[PDB]
């Protein structure tokens, strides 16, 4: 995605579900059809309220209670041409927001353009048949945050590369305090 | 002395009257009374030192190792 | 005859019954083993022990605290269990004297073994010991001094007592430093004795002198995501609400409809309920919100949009300490803000300690709560430093409650022994002999204190005994050079509460252990 | 260092070496904690601190 | 003992309690009934323990807040109906208790449990209550005092109530025993 | 003589009984309180003495000389909220076996929410139940509440706000002893609470035990408490 | 119900009246039975506490026969018909006996349905004896005699 | 031995001297399985199949009688003693002590909501720990107690022993069947 507006949502894009024990009681085939129809309408209204802000990249927090992204919501987001990345972890939220400038949205009502983060590119780059990375390059209002990607030919040299880089960073930290 | 009935029949055929008669014991008569009296005497001679103001206590340790120091005969026994 | 050595055994397989001499044998050897274990930790030059647990974790501790050492040992002797429980009770009552009481009980039982060997009934012994305990209590009470009236003299006694408590512990390296800490930490309570108010954070790294008592308060919790990170003139709401998928406590309540549209309307109603709750909160006019329980994503977003710092998951202890340090009221209902008191601190920021970030409340309003940051090179150093600080704070709290003080360095024990000696030489019979043994144990306490440094314990205790017989009731051990001196001048003073409890608990446990003439064990499980 | 499991670690860090090889001796475990404290406070020098401690004790 | 049994000389009509402690001559026969105290709840000590001409309600009735039936399911869609249902459970119980109270019975025995609410209710009315009484002790109380055991509290006439000249709760060797004498 | 005016023959008997025990170090102090205990709790018409009315509680710490008789009750609990006051003089006590929570039928029940109005009605019902409980407790005139079944955050804070110190999770036996001692009646629901069903205690205090964090509640200075506690 | 039963309450009134309705129904059932003249009821299944209450009220002797063969043989004995419903019996469905009583033969308690006529559909031989083995052997001898007849 | 023990006659002589010591049936097929074939069975078999079918029908009707509740319900502390300590005789009880706050507790409650319908014979209850136990520690949830006749049969306590956030509705089912409460038909997969 070029000229990416990114939104990080902490709510779920799936059939409605109250915090209480809810049930939908059917006693007529009319209700049976209306159930699916109204579910589609709910999900479509959600993806429309997301699309209308100009968002084209969508990060979705991880939800273990209920489905954070139904296949219907995925279909609608795809047709709206919005890149969607789910299973974001609840510990990376402060990091992601500090990096991009996004603001986490926990209720669709407050999903406005002012809660997005403008990046100059967001791509999923292949690591020559060794996995894939979702890299966001460029960010307006860039944060006091940076990421280092550590490559290597075996997990042991990689692990010691990580440790060595940590040693160098801790040296520069030992230099920021007690400047001697 | 014990082991209840021991005859095994005069003819030579098995004589089994009580279940586990071979594993069971029995004491009869004056020797039973004497055993009772020795047991009671042991218990009483244990307790008699915890009697009166100058009586001393006993330190009981349970199955899991908790300690109880007492002079109360009911608690001791 | 006898219970065990009888022609018939009266017990289940695995039980046993130790009689008169064998019972006193096991009792005395076990108690004296416990005592010889816990001594050598006694006094300024006492050395630490290693608590190399054999569990699947193999916990490792380095302690000079007698209570901890005895708690963390596998004891099988019942008399030793008695002494262990006695030290635990000492640690509960006051925070010091667990090694002094353990050593005292063990020495009393050693002397009682000697006396039983002399063919004396342990009733004449217990009688004489009760008489000696009376005499010792009166001598202690008569020597005690109270300075709680004079504020400056009270400050001096508090500093001296904290110093005397930390002298024996690993903090004697930087005693003065930690002395000041402990004193300030107990004075910030403003008369209260709540030691749960004093929070101690142990941060690995740094030297032991890098430890300090924060002028404000520190909390190891997190701020929300889109919420501020610095707040001046903070108005604070301390709460114990749900803010976590908050459900109406009616449990039979269930959403039962015929249309997903209604399910969505009811979901929106739930969200609107949470929003109205947050609005009721904000109607208090706050900038910081601390919740005992979690704060889910939607109220997090609301507090962020409102510009409020929402600290979550603070525990019951955390919220109590925050209420004490800021002045707020722990609330769970927000329909009457005029009744909810808010907390105030000049500043709430985020600070770095080691490699972890913490919330720093500075300029707090009340201060009747504290945070002490303990730095150290090893987790064992940190645990022993915290244990020693707990000792010092417990003793200073006990003194603020009861300002009575009594001089240490063996002055108190020697004085009590002198009173017991006067009583003994004026008393007829073998009770005089048991009084003399009581006095010997009291004397054997400073003897051990001196041994642990490497001085002529016999010479020094002889000088002290002669002085206290002469009338110099303030003569005690000066452990810097290894001489005798004036405890009043050197600042070696203890809490009368602590010394009296030491005496009484030791004499009491020795009495109960001496009344035993039979040990009837049951088949172990 | 091949731990109890099949987890392998090739390392030059003193803190990592020490905390990956269960030492089973109170003083050695204290040295592990020392290397940990140096890793916290400074981040490098975790071998030097352990060597200095061992040397001070060999001098004692 | 045997000269009191009526015509079948039932052994179940002779009660034999064994109270550890005391001498054989301290043993006794009560021309009446006696049985051990039965798992009293809170408020039982607030109850009185001696009555001088009590009327006795013998019941097979569970007196406590309980599911009106195990296969019973309440369904309401209104908080007013919720409140009404709560108060309805309470009124059911309190109605049982009020019927038991108005029968004149100052002593109440149930073969089934008597909850803490009922215990405290009877304590406030200065009545005595004992639940979980064993079936045999109940039948003996019936044959001695002269009433009938009632599974329903809706017809508690003096015809079905029992009566004795003295009721007491006394200590017998470490145990507490209720005596209808 | 077994009268309450000449307790010397009874103190002599009790001292003889306690002569052989380790507590003879406080011989008469122990004997006296045993006598007073049995005299406090007894139908003295040569009738029985129910020991359930004597609560024998022990707490490590202190001295044997601290063992005493409390003509009232001791509980192993503290006030429910940490900011409530730790002392209450001339305490009017409401003894309750109802948890301060929204009512719940014992029968299997399902309250159905079918509309946003049903949800809001449920919400306000919960709010108003909590407020109505606290208002009913206040209107009786009580200065202290003692529940048997614990309560929740809203009820706890409303008690604090309304200046109603409260204890929760008190046991059935202790609830009974508090009722017997304070002269109060045990109440199963708030609607049944009145100023006459209340007990009176001349002192309700929270007591500490040094460096422990453990608190106990003493209720004493009752008028004619037929219950008693021996604190060892 | 054979399918499944749930008491669906929706009003405090139904809740207050359900149990009273249950007992009033039981009282009606047993009073219809007693008013047919029945003084003895023999049920092959269980007995409910309320039904027992009302049987005692209306002076009916209740007997419970766990076995089904025992019930069939009792029906043959007394001239009755086993009713699968708790409906009062018609003049033909009822059985009669010159006496029905509880007695104690030895240690054993027994319920006796005894005719006075020297006839009937079933006759019982009460075997007394000092040993269970002896009585089983005498029962075998009785079987031999009956098979000979 | 002096020589290697192998297929030789010397070892055999030594051994002789004393050295060198030397669909099954309609009986198991369920109601569904019985319908599956019906025709397969021979009529001579079908005579006893009638009896086995009546037996299985009786067993199924018994289980229908036994499935009282089949759904998760919440009890307060006050009635706990009646619901758990004095539950139905021989009825397996599973109590989930939980606070709504902890998400792992909510996951366990969802899994229990599923298992309740899956296992209508077992009683499934849930309760707030602070409201069941006076001052139940915060970091000691979720707590799964397994009860029988008022006696505790099992206690999976802790936010770590229970089986981690990856806990599906399968490994919990097995953990509950460890004490033999719900009696699932599988093994511990994860
Ligand atoms: N400077 C000093 N001179 C003499 N004695 C001291 C000095 N500092 C501390 N002490 C003594 O050292 C002892 C320390 O005891 P401690 O190890 O705390 O015993 P416990 O663990 O039983 O409390 C105190 O009894 C005190 O009398
Ligand atoms: Mg000390
Ligand atoms: Mg005696």
Numbering used by the authors:
A (entry chain d): 241 to 420
B (entry chain e): 2 to 78
C (entry chain b): 2 to 526
D (entry chain d): 61 to 120
E (entry chain h): 182 to 362
F (entry chain e): 156 to 387
G (entry chain q): 251 to 399
H (entry chain P): 1 to 22, 45 to 212
Question: Which sentences from the paper describe this structure?
Answer:
The chaperonin TCP-1 ring complex (TRiC) acts as obligate folder for >10% of cytosolic proteins, including he cytoskeletal proteins actin and tubulin. Eight paralogous subunits (CCT1–CCT8) assemble into a hexadecamer of two back-to-back rings, enclosing a folding chamber. We trapped endogenous human TRiC with substrates (actin, tubulin) and cochaperone (PhLP2A) at different folding stages, for structure determination by cryo-EM.
Intriguingly, another symmetry-relaxed 3D class (20.0% of all closed particles) presented additional density within both ring cavities, clearly different from the first class with tubulin. Another canonical substrate of TRiC, actin, could account for part of the density, into which we indeed built an actin monomer on the basis of its detection in LC–MS/MS. ACTB and ACTG1 differ only in their first ten residues, most of which are disordered in our model. We therefore used ACTB to build our atomic model, though the sample is likely to be a mixture of both ACTB and ACTG1 isoforms of non-muscle actin. Our model of actin, positioned similarly to tubulin, depicts a partly folded monomer coordinated by specific interactions with the ‘CCT6 hemisphere’ of closed-TRiC state. By contrast, subdomains 2 and 4, known as the ‘pointed end’, are more disordered, making less contact to TRiC than the barbed end. We therefore identified PhLP2A helix H1, helix H3, and its preceding loop, in addition to TXND, and built their atomic models into the cryo-EM density. Upon reaching the level of the CCT2′ and CCT3′ apical domains in the trans cavity, helix H2 is followed by a loop region and helix H3, which traverses 35 Å latitudinally to the other hemisphere of this cavity close to CCT6, reaching the C-terminal TXND. This TXND fold, highly conserved across all PhLPs and superimposable with the PhLP2B TXND structure, contacts TRiC through the CCT5 apical domain loops, and partly through the flanking subunits of CCT2, CCT7, and CCT4. Altogether, this ternary complex structure confirms PhLP2A as a binding partner of actin, and depicts PhLP2A as a molecular ‘strut,’ anchored to the TRiC trans cavity, while reaching out to hold and stabilize the actin folding intermediate in the cis cavity.
